[PDB]
Amino acid sequence: SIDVKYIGVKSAYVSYDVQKRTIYLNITNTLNITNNNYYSVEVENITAQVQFSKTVIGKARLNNITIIGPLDMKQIDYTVPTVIAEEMSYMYDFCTLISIKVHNIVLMMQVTVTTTYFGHSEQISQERYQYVDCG
Amino acid sequence: SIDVKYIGVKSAYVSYDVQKRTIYLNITNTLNITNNNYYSVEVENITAQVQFSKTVIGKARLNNITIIGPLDMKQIDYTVPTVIAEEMSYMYDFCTLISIKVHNIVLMMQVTVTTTYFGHSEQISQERYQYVDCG
Amino acid sequence: SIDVKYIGVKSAYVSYDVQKRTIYLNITNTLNITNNNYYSVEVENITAQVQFSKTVIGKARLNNITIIGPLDMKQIDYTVPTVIAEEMSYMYDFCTLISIKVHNIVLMMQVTVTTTYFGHSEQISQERYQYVDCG
Amino acid sequence: SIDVKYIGVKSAYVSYDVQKRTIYLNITNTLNITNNNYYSVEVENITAQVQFSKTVIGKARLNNITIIGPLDMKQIDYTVPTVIAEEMSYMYDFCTLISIKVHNIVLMMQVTVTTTYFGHSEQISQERYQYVDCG
Amino acid sequence: SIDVKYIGVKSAYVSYDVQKRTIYLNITNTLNITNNNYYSVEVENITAQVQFSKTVIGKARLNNITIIGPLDMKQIDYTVPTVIAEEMSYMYDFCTLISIKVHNIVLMMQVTVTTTYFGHSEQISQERYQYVDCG
Amino acid sequence: SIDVKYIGVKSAYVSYDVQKRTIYLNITNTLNITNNNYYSVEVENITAQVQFSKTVIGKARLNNITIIGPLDMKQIDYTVPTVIAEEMSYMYDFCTLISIKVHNIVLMMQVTVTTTYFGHSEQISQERYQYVDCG
Amino acid sequence: SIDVKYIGVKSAYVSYDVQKRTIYLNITNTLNITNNNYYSVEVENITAQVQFSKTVIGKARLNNITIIGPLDMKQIDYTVPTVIAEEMSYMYDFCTLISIKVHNIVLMMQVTVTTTYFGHSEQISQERYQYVDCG
Amino acid sequence: SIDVKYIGVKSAYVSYDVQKRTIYLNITNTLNITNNNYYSVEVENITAQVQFSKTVIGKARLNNITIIGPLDMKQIDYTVPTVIAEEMSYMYDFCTLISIKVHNIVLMMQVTVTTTYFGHSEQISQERYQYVDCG
Amino acid sequence: SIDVKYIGVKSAYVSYDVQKRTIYLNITNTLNITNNNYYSVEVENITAQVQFSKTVIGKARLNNITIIGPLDMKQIDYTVPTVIAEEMSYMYDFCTLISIKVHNIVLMMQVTVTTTYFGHSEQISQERYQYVDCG
Amino acid sequence: SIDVKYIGVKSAYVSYDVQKRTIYLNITNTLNITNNNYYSVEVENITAQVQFSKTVIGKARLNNITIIGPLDMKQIDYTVPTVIAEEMSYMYDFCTLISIKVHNIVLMMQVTVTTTYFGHSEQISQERYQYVDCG
Numbered sequence A, B, C, D, E, F, G, H, I, J: 001s002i003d004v005k006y007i008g009v010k011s012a013y014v015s016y017d018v019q020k021r022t023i024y025l026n027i028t029n030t031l032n033i034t035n036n037n038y039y040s041v042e043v044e045n046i047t048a049q050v051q052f053s054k055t056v057i058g059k060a061r062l063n064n065i066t067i068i069g070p071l072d073m074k075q076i077d078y079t080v081p082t083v084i085a086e087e088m089s090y091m092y093d094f095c096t097l098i099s100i101k102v103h104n105i106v107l108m109m110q111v112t113v114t115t116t117y118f119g120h121s122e123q124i125s126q127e128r129y130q131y132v133d134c135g
């Protein structure tokens, strides 16, 4: 990635900022700018490319062959019992929360068993994350 | 990705900002700008490319062959019992929440068993995330 | 992706902003701008490309062969009992919510068993996400 | 994707903004602009391309062969009992909600068993998401 | 990655900042700037490349062969019981929360069993993370 | 009064009481009784008795002469307000009574201004008094 | 008063009491009784008795002469307000009573201003008094 | 008063009491009784008795002469306010009573201003008094 | 008073008491009794008795003459306020009572201003007094 | 008073008491009793008795003459406020009582201003007094 940028407030080439009650007198500004950008990226010079896979099985016997891919959850138990037995009292509950499984951003490209891959793969994630604000 | 950008408030090439009760006197501004951008990206020079897969099975016997792909949940149990037995009291509940499974952004490109892939894959995710604000 | 941009408030090439009770006197502005952008992207020079798959089975016997693709949920149980037995009391419930399974944005391109793919795949997701605001 | 943009409030090439009770005196503005954009994208130079798949089965016997594609839910149970037995009390419920399965945007391109694909696939999702606002 | 940048507040080439009630007298500014950037990246000069895999099994017998990919959860139990038995007292709960499994950003490129990969893979993650602010 | 008697249960001269499952064998009872009572009471031996009253008023003047006998109530106020404002409750009232002025036995012989009395006056009061029994 | 008697249970001259499962064998009872009572009471031997009252008023003037006998109540105020404002509660009232002025036995012989009395006056009061029994 | 008697349970001249499961064998009882009572009481031997009162008023003037007999109540105030404001509670009231003015036995013989009395006056009061029994 | 008697349980001349499971064998009882009582009481031997009162007023003037007999209450105030403000509690009231003015036995013979009395006056009061028994 | 007696349980001339499971064998009882009582009391031997009172007022002036008999209450104030403000507690009140003015036995013979009395006056009071018993 030639250019990746996280700029919180302001991004600019040339910035003239006059802010919060200043007195701005005689000014002359002369800006002479020549800018050239030439981008050649991911150009590929390739005569011949071969992707070839071959499998042969003969005079063979297979019984109870098991291939199980990734990300198996099987047996997972979430038990979160909450019991409140307020008899004769005062209870104030403000900004109270319970969360079990929260997934914001899930990015998954390739999960397989057998893979032949020729090329380019790029993942870019940018975020501002504020979970809980109260009061 | 040639250009990826997270600019919180303002993005500009040339910015003249006069803000919050300033006094802006005699100014002359002369801007002379020449800008050239030439973009050649992902150009590919390819004579011959072959993707070929072959399978042959002969004089073979297969029994109880099991292939199970990824992301298997099988047995998952969520038990969240809540019991409130307020008898003779005062209870104020403001900004209270329960969430079990929350998925905001799920991006998945390729899940398989056998894959031959020639090319380019790009995933870009940008977000501002504020979950809970109260009060 | 040549240009991907997250600009919170304002994006502009040349910006003259006069805001919040300023006094704007004698100004002369001369802007002379020449801009050229030439975009050649994803051009491909390809003489011959072959995608070929062949399978032959002979003198073979197959019994109980099982292929199960990805994303199998099987057995999932959500139990969320809520019991409220307010007898002689005061209960105020404001901004209270329960959510089990919430999916905002799901993007899935390709899930298979056997795939041969030649080309380009691009996924871009941009969002501003505010879940709960109350009070 | 040459240009993808998330601009919250305002996007413009040249912006003259006079806002909130300013006094705007003698100004002369001269803007001389020449802009050329040439877009050649996804041009493909291809002489011969062949997509060919062949299967032959002979002198073979198959019994109980099972292929099951992805996204199988099988057995899923949602039990959310709510019982309220208010006897002699005061209950105020404002901004209260229960949601089990909410799907806003689901985008799925290709799910199969066997796929040969030549070409280009692009998915772009942009949204502003505010779930619950009350009070 | 030629350029990766985390700029908290402001990024600019030339910045003239007049802020917080200054008095700005006679100034003349002359800026003469010529800037050229030429980017050739990821260009590859390749005559012939071959990716080839072959497997043959003959006169062999296989029984109870088990291959299980990564990320197996098997048996996981979350037990978080909470019981409150307030009898005749005063309880104020403000900014109280319980969270079991929270995943913000998960990026996974390739998990497999057998993989042959020719190319380039890039992952960039930038975020500002504030979890809980209250009071 | 020669004989005044309060005998709660039984009064008798000679009492043979066989009670509550006794065995009463050979008995011979011989009772020889001689009883003489001679009553001379309130015999009066009187030759001459004179009751004489005389009043004479002469050459006299009387104005605003006021004689007021006994037992004057004049101004008496009984105020017993009872207000019951049962809103949403349970009230059981069993054996509840209000009494202001209760007079059981009033015996008055002589009230006068001027009295001359020769003789005998006797008042005898006997009672069993149980006011309130409940439950 | 020659004989005044308060005998709670039993009064008798000769009492043979066989009670509560006794065995009463050979008995011979011989009772020989001679009883003489001679009562001479209140016999009076009187030759001459004179009751004489005389009043004479002459050459006299009387104005605003006031004679007021006994037992004057004039101004008496009984204020017994009872207010019950049971809102949301449980009240059980069993054996509850309010009494202001209760007079059981009032015996008054002579109230006057001027009295001449020759003779005998006797008052006898006998009672068993149980006011409130409950439960 | 020759004989005044308070006998709680039993009064008798000769008492043979066989009680509570005794065995009563050979008995012979011989009772020989002679009893003489002679009562001469209140016999009076009187030749001459004179009761004489005389009043004479002459050449006299009387103005604002006030004679007020005994037992004057004038101004008496009974204020017994009772207020019960049970909100959300439990109140059990058993055997509860309020009494202001209770008079059981009032015996008054003579109240006057001027009295001449010749004779005999006797007052006898006998009672068993139990006010409140509960439970 | 020749005979005044307070006998709690039993009064008798001759008492044979066989009580609580005794064995009563051979007995012979011979009782020989002679009893004589002669009562001469209050006999009076009187020849001449004179009760004489005389008043004369002459050439006299009387103004504002005030004679007020005994037992004057004038101004008496009873204030007994009771306020119970049970909010959210438990109150059990058993055997609770309030009494202001209770008079059981009032015996008054003579109250006057001027009294001449010849004779005999006797007052006898006997009682068993139990006020409050509960539980 | 010749005979005044307080006998708690039993009074008798001759008492044979067989009580609480005794064995009573051969007994012979011979009782020979002669009893004589002669009562001469309050006999009076009187020839001549004179009660005489005389008042004369002449040539006299009386103004504001005030005679006030005994037992004057004038101004008496009873203030007994009771306030109970039980909020959220437990109060058990058993055997609780308030009494202000309790008079059991009042015996008054003579109150006057001027009294001439010839004779005999006797007052006898006997009681068993138990006020409060509980529990």
Ligand SMILES: *[C@@H]1O[C@H](CO)[C@@H](O)[C@H](O)[C@H]1NC(C)=O
Residues within 6 Å of the ligand: A025, A026, B026
């Ligand atoms: C600069 O500004 C001042 C303002 O007081 C003005 O008098 C003066 O002429 C200006 N000079 C130039 C060169 O513009």
Ligand SMILES: *[C@@H]1O[C@H](CO)[C@@H](O)[C@H](O)[C@H]1NC(C)=O
Residues within 6 Å of the ligand: A032, A033, A034, E032
């Ligand atoms: C502006 O820049 C160009 C760049 O080649 C130059 O030729 C020209 O003379 C400059 N003019 C001024 C006024 O600076």
Ligand SMILES: *[C@@H]1O[C@H](CO)[C@@H](O)[C@H](O)[C@H]1NC(C)=O
Residues within 6 Å of the ligand: A046, A047, B045, B047, C045
């Ligand atoms: C690569 O591209 C050039 C033109 O840019 C062409 O002359 C050349 O033949 C291409 N390569 C092959 C192997 O054909």
Ligand SMILES: *[C@@H]1O[C@H](CO)[C@@H](O)[C@H](O)[C@H]1NC(C)=O
Residues within 6 Å of the ligand: A063, A064, B064, E063, E064
């Ligand atoms: C395959 O698994 C089953 C049960 O898991 C088992 O009974 C069987 O014997 C296995 N296969 C072989 C060839 O052992």
Ligand SMILES: *[C@@H]1O[C@H](CO)[C@@H](O)[C@H](O)[C@H]1NC(C)=O
Residues within 6 Å of the ligand: B025, B026, C026
């Ligand atoms: C600058 O502004 C001032 C304002 O006071 C004016 O008098 C003066 O003429 C201006 N000068 C020029 C060169 O514009």
Ligand SMILES: *[C@@H]1O[C@H](CO)[C@@H](O)[C@H](O)[C@H]1NC(C)=O
Residues within 6 Å of the ligand: A032, B032, B033, B034
């Ligand atoms: C503006 O820039 C161009 C760039 O070639 C230059 O030729 C020209 O002289 C400049 N003019 C001025 C007034 O700066």
Ligand SMILES: *[C@@H]1O[C@H](CO)[C@@H](O)[C@H](O)[C@H]1NC(C)=O
Residues within 6 Å of the ligand: B046, B047, C045, C047, D045
């Ligand atoms: C590549 O493109 C050029 C023209 O840009 C063409 O002359 C050449 O023949 C192409 N390559 C092949 C292998 O044909």
Ligand SMILES: *[C@@H]1O[C@H](CO)[C@@H](O)[C@H](O)[C@H]1NC(C)=O
Residues within 6 Å of the ligand: A063, A064, B063, B064, C064
């Ligand atoms: C396949 O599985 C079943 C049950 O899981 C089992 O009974 C059978 O024996 C297995 N196949 C072989 C060839 O063992």
Ligand SMILES: *[C@@H]1O[C@H](CO)[C@@H](O)[C@H](O)[C@H]1NC(C)=O
Residues within 6 Å of the ligand: C025, C026, D026
């Ligand atoms: C600048 O503005 C002022 C306003 O006070 C004016 O008097 C003056 O003539 C202006 N100068 C020019 C050069 O426009």
Ligand SMILES: *[C@@H]1O[C@H](CO)[C@@H](O)[C@H](O)[C@H]1NC(C)=O
Residues within 6 Å of the ligand: B032, C032, C033, C034
């Ligand atoms: C404007 O820019 C062009 C760019 O070639 C230049 O030729 C011309 O002289 C410029 N004119 C002015 C007034 O700056």
Ligand SMILES: *[C@@H]1O[C@H](CO)[C@@H](O)[C@H](O)[C@H]1NC(C)=O
Residues within 6 Å of the ligand: C046, C047, D045, D047
């Ligand atoms: C590629 O395109 C050019 C024209 O742009 C053409 O002359 C050439 O023949 C093409 N390539 C092939 C292999 O034909």
Ligand SMILES: *[C@@H]1O[C@H](CO)[C@@H](O)[C@H](O)[C@H]1NC(C)=O
Residues within 6 Å of the ligand: B063, B064, C063, C064, D064
């Ligand atoms: C296939 O599965 C069934 C039940 O799961 C089993 O009974 C059978 O034996 C299996 N096939 C073979 C060839 O074992």
Ligand SMILES: *[C@@H]1O[C@H](CO)[C@@H](O)[C@H](O)[C@H]1NC(C)=O
Residues within 6 Å of the ligand: D025, D026
């Ligand atoms: C600038 O504006 C002012 C307003 O006060 C005016 O007097 C003056 O003539 C103007 N100057 C020009 C050059 O327009």
Ligand SMILES: *[C@@H]1O[C@H](CO)[C@@H](O)[C@H](O)[C@H]1NC(C)=O
Residues within 6 Å of the ligand: C032, D032, D033, D034
């Ligand atoms: C405007 O720009 C063009 C660009 O070629 C230039 O030729 C021309 O001279 C410019 N005119 C002015 C007045 O700036």
Ligand SMILES: *[C@@H]1O[C@H](CO)[C@@H](O)[C@H](O)[C@H]1NC(C)=O
Residues within 6 Å of the ligand: C063, C064, D063, D064
């Ligand atoms: C296919 O499945 C059925 C039931 O699942 C089973 O009875 C049968 O045996 C299986 N086929 C073979 C060839 O075993």
Ligand SMILES: *[C@@H]1O[C@H](CO)[C@@H](O)[C@H](O)[C@H]1NC(C)=O
Residues within 6 Å of the ligand: A026, E025, E026
């Ligand atoms: C600088 O500013 C002052 C303002 O007081 C002005 O008098 C003076 O003429 C200015 N000088 C120049 C060279 O602009």
